[PDB]
C-alpha cells in the first residue's frame, strides 16, 4: 500500500458546483493514497525534511508522525464558469488534476 496516484472522478453536479462551473460535467482529478515508510523511494521526491521525519518515526513513533502521501505536481484543466452572469473560458485552470504523488 505504498504512496501512489489512484483514480478520483469529480462530478460537478454531484458536488453542487455546476451553479457556477458549466463545463466540463466532471473530470479525472486523481488522488494520492498509501503510506510513506522509511526509506522513502526516490520516485516519491522526498524532501530532506520528509526523509528525516520518516526516520525519526521509525526510531520513536511517539516523537514524530509518518511523512504524508500528497500530490506533488498538479495540472490544469479547461473550464467554463459563470461569474455574475458572465461566461469565462480558461483553457488552463491550474491546480485541478494530480500528475505526481510524493511523500512530504
Amino acid at each position: 500500500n505504498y504512496c501512489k496516484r489512484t483514480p478520483l472522478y469529480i462530478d460537478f453536479k454531484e458536488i453542487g458546483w455546476d451553479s457556477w462551473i458549466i463545463a466540463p460535467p466532471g473530470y479525472e482529478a486523481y488522488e494520492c493514497r498509501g503510506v510513506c515508510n522509511y526509506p522513502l523511494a526516490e520516485h516519491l521526491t522526498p524532501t530532506k525534511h520528509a526523509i528525516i521525519q520518516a526516520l525519526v518515526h521509525l526510531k520513536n513513533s511517539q516523537k514524530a508522525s509518518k511523512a504524508c502521501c500528497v500530490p506533488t505536481k498538479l495540472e490544469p484543466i479547461s473550464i467554463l464558469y459563470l461569474d455574475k452572469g458572465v461566461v469565462t473560458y480558461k483553457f488552463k485552470y491550474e491546480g485541478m488534476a494530480v500528475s505526481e504523488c510524493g511523500c512530504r
Binding site: 463545463a23 484543466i77 483553457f91 485541478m96
Partner: protein
C-alpha cells in the same frame, strides 16, 4: 493528425492563430462548443480547444453530443459538448437522460 495529436476545430472567441473561424488544437486537445438554447432560439457562445488533461468523459464522442443534463443555471439553456474529430464542434446534438423514476413519478 493522430500521430502528432493535432486537430482542427471551429473557433469563436473574439504560438497558434485562429484566422477564418478555425483553430488548431494540439497536445490531444478536443474541440468544444458552448451554445445557449431555449426552444427554437439558439445562440453560439464560444468554440475552440478543450485540454485533454482531466480526460473529461463526453470529450470522447467523435461528434459534439451533450450527454449530461444541462446545468439548472440560466433556465437549463446551456449546451456544452466536446469531441475528438476535426471540425466536430460546428453543430451539436442532445442525448441526455430523462429525470429518474420516483414513487411520486
Amino acid at each position: 493528425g493522430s500521430q502528432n495529436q493535432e486537430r482542427l476545430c471551429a473557433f469563436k472567441d473574439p504560438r497558434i492563430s485562429h484566422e477564418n473561424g478555425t483553430i488548431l488544437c494540439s497536445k490531444g486537445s478536443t474541440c468544444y462548443g458552448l451554445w445557449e438554447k431555449s426552444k427554437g432560439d439558439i445562440n453560439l457562445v464560444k468554440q475552440g480547444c478543450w485540454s485533454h488533461i482531466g480526460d473529461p468523459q463526453e470529450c470522447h464522442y467523435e461528434e459534439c453530443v451533450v450527454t449530461t443534463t444541462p446545468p439548472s443555471i440560466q433556465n437549463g439553456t446551456y449546451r456544452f459538448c466536446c469531441c475528438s474529430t476535426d471540425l466536430c464542434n460546428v453543430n451539436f446534438t442532445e442525448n441526455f437522460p430523462p429525470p429518474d423514476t420516483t414513487p411520486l413519478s
